Design a protein around this motif. Sequence first.
Motif, PDB file in Angstrom:
ATOM      1  N   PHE A   1       5.868  -4.691   2.864  1.00 18.54           N
ATOM      2  CA  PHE A   1       5.512  -4.669   1.491  1.00 18.54           C
ATOM      3  C   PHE A   1       5.929  -6.016   0.815  1.00 18.54           C
ATOM      4  O   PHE A   1       5.146  -6.823   0.064  1.00 18.54           O
ATOM      5  CB  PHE A   1       6.163  -3.565   0.697  1.00 18.54           C
ATOM      6  CG  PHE A   1       5.601  -2.049   0.720  1.00 18.54           C
ATOM      7  CD1 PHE A   1       4.002  -2.034   1.259  1.00 18.54           C
ATOM      8  CD2 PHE A   1       6.199  -1.075   0.752  1.00 18.54           C
ATOM      9  CE1 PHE A   1       3.805  -0.890   1.419  1.00 18.54           C
ATOM     10  CE2 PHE A   1       5.631   0.411   0.913  1.00 18.54           C
ATOM     11  CZ  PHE A   1       4.524   0.420   1.222  1.00 18.54           C
ATOM     12  N   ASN A   2       7.173  -6.499   1.147  1.00 19.68           N
ATOM     13  CA  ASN A   2       7.648  -7.823   0.307  1.00 19.68           C
ATOM     14  C   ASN A   2       7.172  -9.066   0.964  1.00 19.68           C
ATOM     15  O   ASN A   2       7.436 -10.042   0.614  1.00 19.68           O
ATOM     16  CB  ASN A   2       9.061  -7.611   0.199  1.00 19.68           C
ATOM     17  CG  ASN A   2       9.276  -6.727  -0.877  1.00 19.68           C
ATOM     18  OD1 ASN A   2       8.968  -6.890  -1.897  1.00 19.68           O
ATOM     19  ND2 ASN A   2       9.808  -5.483  -0.193  1.00 19.68           N
ATOM     20  N   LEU A   3       6.255  -8.858   2.130  1.00 22.67           N
ATOM     21  CA  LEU A   3       5.506 -10.005   2.925  1.00 22.67           C
ATOM     22  C   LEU A   3       4.190  -9.966   2.463  1.00 22.67           C
ATOM     23  O   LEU A   3       3.259 -10.794   3.211  1.00 22.67           O
ATOM     24  CB  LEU A   3       5.652 -10.034   4.375  1.00 22.67           C
ATOM     25  CG  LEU A   3       7.348 -10.403   4.669  1.00 22.67           C
ATOM     26  CD1 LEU A   3       7.332 -10.080   6.454  1.00 22.67           C
ATOM     27  CD2 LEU A   3       7.617 -11.918   4.847  1.00 22.67           C
ATOM     28  N   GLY A   4       3.790  -9.123   1.645  1.00 20.71           N
ATOM     29  CA  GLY A   4       2.425  -9.051   1.046  1.00 20.71           C
ATOM     30  C   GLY A   4       1.458  -7.972   1.479  1.00 20.71           C
ATOM     31  O   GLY A   4       0.360  -8.049   1.404  1.00 20.71           O
ATOM     32  N   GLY A   5       2.046  -7.023   2.509  1.00 16.62           N
ATOM     33  CA  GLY A   5       1.229  -5.967   3.102  1.00 16.62           C
ATOM     34  C   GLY A   5       0.494  -4.852   2.488  1.00 16.62           C
ATOM     35  O   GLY A   5       1.327  -4.538   1.544  1.00 16.62           O
ATOM     36  N   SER A   6      -0.507  -4.427   2.704  1.00 16.58           N
ATOM     37  CA  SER A   6      -0.992  -3.069   1.891  1.00 16.58           C
ATOM     38  C   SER A   6      -1.511  -2.506   3.127  1.00 16.58           C
ATOM     39  O   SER A   6      -1.948  -3.000   3.887  1.00 16.58           O
ATOM     40  CB  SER A   6      -1.697  -3.215   0.984  1.00 16.58           C
ATOM     41  OG  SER A   6      -2.724  -4.234   1.406  1.00 16.58           O
ATOM     42  N   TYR A   7      -1.495  -0.917   3.165  1.00 18.28           N
ATOM     43  CA  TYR A   7      -1.677  -0.200   4.294  1.00 18.28           C
ATOM     44  C   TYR A   7      -3.073   0.335   4.099  1.00 18.28           C
ATOM     45  O   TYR A   7      -3.834   0.483   5.052  1.00 18.28           O
ATOM     46  CB  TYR A   7      -0.872   1.069   4.212  1.00 18.28           C
ATOM     47  CG  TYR A   7       0.483   1.084   5.082  1.00 18.28           C
ATOM     48  CD1 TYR A   7       0.627   0.832   6.112  1.00 18.28           C
ATOM     49  CD2 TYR A   7       1.709   1.477   4.103  1.00 18.28           C
ATOM     50  CE1 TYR A   7       1.838   0.649   6.891  1.00 18.28           C
ATOM     51  CE2 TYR A   7       2.583   1.250   4.749  1.00 18.28           C
ATOM     52  CZ  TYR A   7       3.030   1.007   6.122  1.00 18.28           C
ATOM     53  OH  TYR A   7       4.145   0.991   6.748  1.00 18.28           O
ATOM     54  N   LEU A   8      -3.774   0.128   2.759  1.00 18.81           N
ATOM     55  CA  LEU A   8      -5.121   0.574   2.738  1.00 18.81           C
ATOM     56  C   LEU A   8      -5.948  -0.482   2.535  1.00 18.81           C
ATOM     57  O   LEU A   8      -5.662  -1.515   1.509  1.00 18.81           O
ATOM     58  CB  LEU A   8      -5.495   1.611   1.652  1.00 18.81           C
ATOM     59  CG  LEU A   8      -4.594   2.926   1.927  1.00 18.81           C
ATOM     60  CD1 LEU A   8      -4.790   3.786   0.689  1.00 18.81           C
ATOM     61  CD2 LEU A   8      -4.949   3.537   3.060  1.00 18.81           C
ATOM     62  N   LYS A   9      -6.944  -0.889   3.158  1.00 23.97           N
ATOM     63  CA  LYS A   9      -7.889  -1.979   3.166  1.00 23.97           C
ATOM     64  C   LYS A   9      -9.273  -1.527   2.876  1.00 23.97           C
ATOM     65  O   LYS A   9      -9.994  -0.932   3.793  1.00 23.97           O
ATOM     66  CB  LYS A   9      -7.831  -3.114   4.119  1.00 23.97           C
ATOM     67  CG  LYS A   9      -6.513  -3.577   4.347  1.00 23.97           C
ATOM     68  CD  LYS A   9      -6.280  -4.735   5.217  1.00 23.97           C
ATOM     69  CE  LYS A   9      -4.880  -5.148   5.529  1.00 23.97           C
ATOM     70  NZ  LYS A   9      -4.092  -5.261   4.347  1.00 23.97           N
ATOM     71  N   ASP A  10      -9.778  -1.637   1.499  1.00 24.61           N
ATOM     72  CA  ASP A  10     -11.262  -0.914   1.191  1.00 24.61           C
ATOM     73  C   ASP A  10     -11.199   0.555   1.763  1.00 24.61           C
ATOM     74  O   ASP A  10     -12.298   0.875   2.254  1.00 24.61           O
ATOM     75  CB  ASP A  10     -12.175  -1.802   1.683  1.00 24.61           C
ATOM     76  CG  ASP A  10     -12.161  -3.310   1.212  1.00 24.61           C
ATOM     77  OD1 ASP A  10     -12.248  -3.588   0.274  1.00 24.61           O
ATOM     78  OD2 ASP A  10     -12.106  -4.098   2.438  1.00 24.61           O
ATOM     79  N   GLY A  11     -10.264   1.298   1.460  1.00 20.79           N
ATOM     80  CA  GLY A  11      -9.784   2.576   1.783  1.00 20.79           C
ATOM     81  C   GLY A  11      -9.773   2.895   3.159  1.00 20.79           C
ATOM     82  O   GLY A  11      -9.482   4.144   3.610  1.00 20.79           O
ATOM     83  N   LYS A  12      -9.888   2.072   4.128  1.00 23.73           N
ATOM     84  CA  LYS A  12      -9.466   2.168   5.487  1.00 23.73           C
ATOM     85  C   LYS A  12      -7.922   2.043   5.767  1.00 23.73           C
ATOM     86  O   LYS A  12      -7.381   1.113   5.468  1.00 23.73           O
ATOM     87  CB  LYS A  12     -10.099   1.159   6.581  1.00 23.73           C
ATOM     88  CG  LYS A  12      -9.775   1.231   7.915  1.00 23.73           C
ATOM     89  CD  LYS A  12     -10.472  -0.018   8.753  1.00 23.73           C
ATOM     90  CE  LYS A  12     -10.044  -0.017  10.340  1.00 23.73           C
ATOM     91  NZ  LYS A  12     -10.249   1.225  10.920  1.00 23.73           N
ATOM     92  N   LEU A  13      -7.199   2.801   6.560  1.00 20.32           N
ATOM     93  CA  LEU A  13      -5.822   2.673   6.987  1.00 20.32           C
ATOM     94  C   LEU A  13      -5.723   1.549   8.107  1.00 20.32           C
ATOM     95  O   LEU A  13      -6.440   1.991   9.264  1.00 20.32           O
ATOM     96  CB  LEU A  13      -5.260   3.973   7.340  1.00 20.32           C
ATOM     97  CG  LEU A  13      -3.788   3.844   8.017  1.00 20.32           C
ATOM     98  CD1 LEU A  13      -2.879   3.688   6.816  1.00 20.32           C
ATOM     99  CD2 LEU A  13      -3.478   5.236   8.734  1.00 20.32           C
ATOM    100  N   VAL A  14      -4.868   0.769   7.656  1.00 24.91           N
ATOM    101  CA  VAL A  14      -4.469  -0.483   8.601  1.00 24.91           C
ATOM    102  C   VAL A  14      -3.232  -0.833   8.846  1.00 24.91           C
ATOM    103  O   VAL A  14      -2.426  -0.839   7.733  1.00 24.91           O
ATOM    104  CB  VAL A  14      -5.304  -1.673   8.292  1.00 24.91           C
ATOM    105  CG1 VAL A  14      -5.178  -3.014   9.065  1.00 24.91           C
ATOM    106  CG2 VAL A  14      -6.640  -1.447   8.134  1.00 24.91           C
ATOM    107  N   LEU A  15      -2.603  -0.381  10.256  1.00 26.91           N
ATOM    108  CA  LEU A  15      -1.281  -0.503  10.675  1.00 26.91           C
ATOM    109  C   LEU A  15      -1.033  -1.938  11.319  1.00 26.91           C
ATOM    110  O   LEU A  15       0.179  -2.189  11.587  1.00 26.91           O
ATOM    111  CB  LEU A  15      -1.047   0.569  11.799  1.00 26.91           C
ATOM    112  CG  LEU A  15      -1.239   2.022  10.905  1.00 26.91           C
ATOM    113  CD1 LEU A  15      -0.585   3.021  12.009  1.00 26.91           C
ATOM    114  CD2 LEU A  15      -0.429   2.034   9.979  1.00 26.91           C
ATOM    115  N   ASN A  16      -2.108  -2.604  11.669  1.00 25.16           N
ATOM    116  CA  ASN A  16      -1.938  -3.831  12.516  1.00 25.16           C
ATOM    117  C   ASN A  16      -2.621  -5.338  11.718  1.00 25.16           C
ATOM    118  O   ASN A  16      -2.846  -5.996  12.339  1.00 25.16           O
ATOM    119  CB  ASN A  16      -2.875  -3.893  13.785  1.00 25.16           C
ATOM    120  CG  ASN A  16      -4.156  -3.516  13.585  1.00 25.16           C
ATOM    121  OD1 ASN A  16      -4.608  -3.185  12.618  1.00 25.16           O
ATOM    122  ND2 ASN A  16      -4.764  -3.857  14.553  1.00 25.16           N
TER     123      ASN A  16
END
Length: 395
Positions: free
Chosen positions: A182-197
């Motif tokens: 989170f504190n390096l700017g990350g978000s788990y949902l991209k246009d509603g898709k779950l992204v771990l990588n």
Amino acid sequence: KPEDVIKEQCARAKVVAELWHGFTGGAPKAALENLVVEFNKAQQGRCVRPVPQGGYRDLSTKIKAAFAAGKVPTMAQAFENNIALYLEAKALLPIESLGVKLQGVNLTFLNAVRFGGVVYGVPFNKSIQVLYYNKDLLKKHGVPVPATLEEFVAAAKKLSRAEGGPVYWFQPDASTFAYFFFNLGGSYLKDGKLVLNSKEAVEALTLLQNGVKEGWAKPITSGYINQNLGSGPYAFSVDTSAGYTYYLRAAKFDLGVATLPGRTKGQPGYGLVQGTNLVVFRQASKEEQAVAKDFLEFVLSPRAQAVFATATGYVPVTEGALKDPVYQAYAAENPDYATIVRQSRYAKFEPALAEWEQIRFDILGQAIKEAILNKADPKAALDRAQKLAEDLLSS
Ligand SMILES: Nc1nc2c(ncn2[C@@H]2O[C@H](COP(=O)(O)O[C@H]3[C@@H](O)[C@H](n4ccc(=O)[nH]c4=O)O[C@@H]3CO)[C@H]3CC(O)(O)C[C@H]32)c(=O)[nH]1
Ligand SMILES: [Cl-]
Ligand SMILES: [Cl-]
Ligand SMILES: [Cl-]
């Protein structure tokens, strides 16, 4: 023994509302049980019965088996993602259909339990990550409490060099990864898709793996961080506020609590929100639903929130709890309560997907373990994690 008081109370009762929980012991279990004792004394021929199901994983497993058996409790703790699951089985009663007043409930917590604009849980025991530290070891080397990520990494390298061992302690788990992510700017949902990588995910798991390699970050693999204190030098951890009483009991040093290191000094870092909401199951009788309604209003009352939060380090879920004089007398004597409330303003959630519980532990948590404990390349680990999560989400 409070659970014995309750057993008595529930024997004399015509209507019993079970509450299934994941509290194994310590101040969380004692504080919940003392709340239930006080509630049950104000009743005639009704009671709440708290039932420990093990940890939170054991709780979600037993509730799934309870749907399969047709025999659910009236109430249970649930994470937002477990709520999303229970709603697929259409198993939850809307909280406002019971007549529970939610005015003054923190909108951060209430937003997180709203599905299709409907509230399906009551924020009860909600936690925020904080920076735990060793006040004595920071003073020992003239290191200020770090307010930025850059400061936090510098202080860990500096104290680890002076003390001959890694001083930033962490569990190699989804919860700890979320602070860095989170504190390096990350978000788990991209246009509603779950992204771990995503690259922020790689960057976060790389910074932890680099910390272990460089000798400033120590992976804790057996028990909680607070169960490992006393062996090796400790300066810092990023951990749940609900660990507060557990750190206090274990620490043989002066324990500090601070807001999380952020990108800049303009704002603290975001903390991951954990702990649980209470849900009420549709299959509960009308009478059991009326007990739940009165218990949920009890637990949202300023006095219950003040006592619970000051006993545990959980975040008071209401504006009224902060004005309660028992809360104010503890806060006047102990600044850590104000630090926890201040951190609760900088709060992020993991995704509320039905499958998230399985993904966070068996897929993302496994990838973090492979990278930290077997030196798997961060990207290759998270790329596997992604593929496993897409296949699970497809099925
Ligand atoms: N099942 C499931 N769990 C989830 C989900 N999202 C997050 N979490 C888990 O919530 C725990 C935080 O919830 P919280 O109420 O803040 O803290 C707990 C305890 O963690 C903590 N504790 C207990 C004993 C101790 O010695 N030290 C201590 O700190 O005290 C509290 C009561 O037991 C994290 C920790 C985890 O269990 O490893 C996995 C994480 C989800 O979706 N599902
Ligand atoms: Cl020692
Ligand atoms: Cl010592
Ligand atoms: Cl594969």
